[PDB]
With several copies, the nearest count.
Chain A
Amino acid sequence: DPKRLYCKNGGFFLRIHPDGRVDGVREKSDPHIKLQLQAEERGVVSIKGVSANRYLAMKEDGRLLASKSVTDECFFFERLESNNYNTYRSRKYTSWYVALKRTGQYKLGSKTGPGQKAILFLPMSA
Chain B
Amino acid sequence: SELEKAMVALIDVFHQYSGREGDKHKLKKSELKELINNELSHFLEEIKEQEVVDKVMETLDNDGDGECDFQEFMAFVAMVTTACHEFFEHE
| B-binding residues in A (CB < 8 A) | 6, 8-11, 28, 84, 101-102, 115-118, 122, 124
Contact in complex: B88, A11 (CB < 8 Å): no
Q: Would A84 and B46 count as touching, CB distance under 8 A?
A: no
Rounded to whole Å, the gap between the CB of A111 and the closest CB of chain B is 11
Report chain A residues within 8 Å CB of B88: 84, 122
Chain B residues, Cβ within 8 Å of A11: 51, 55, 87, 90
Is A102 in contact with B87, judged by CB distance below 8 angstroms?
no
Collect the chain B residues with CB atoms within 8 Å of residue A10's CB: 49, 51, 54
Query: Pick the contact of A102 from B54, B90, B91 — CB < 8 Å?
Result: B54
Does B2 lie at the interface of the complex (its beta carbon under 8 Å from any beta carbon of A)?
Answer: no
Q: What residues of chain B lie closer than 8 Å to A28, measured between beta carbons?
A: 90-91
Contacts of A84 in B (CB 8 A): 88
Determine the residue in chain A with the shortest Cβ distance to B83: A11
Looking at chain A's contact residues, the main secondary structure is loop
Residues of A contacting B46 with CB < 8 Å? 8, 117
Q: Could you jot down 11 A-B contacts, CB within 8 Å? A: A8-B87, A10-B51, A11-B51, A28-B90, A101-B49, A115-B48, A116-B49, A117-B48, A117-B49, A117-B51, A122-B90
**Does residue B63 face the partner (Cβ distance < 8 Å to A)?**
no
Nearest CB of B to A70, in Å: 30
Contact of B50 with A by CB under 8 A: yes
Contact partner, B51, options A8, A115, A122, A124, Cβ 8 Å: A8
Q: A10-B54, A11-B55 are in contact. Are A102 and B89 (CB under 8 A)?
A: no
What are the 3 closest A-B residue pairs judged by CB atoms, nearest first?
A117-B49, A10-B51, A9-B51
In angstroms, Cα B85 to Cα A33, docked, is 22
Min C-beta distance of B26 to chain A, whole Å: 24
B49→A118 contact, CB < 8 A: yes
List residues of chain A with CB within 8 A of the CB of B50.
102
Q: Shortest Cβ distance from B51 into chain A, in angstroms?
A: 5
The residue of chain B having its C-beta at the shortest distance from the C-beta of A4 within the complex is B90
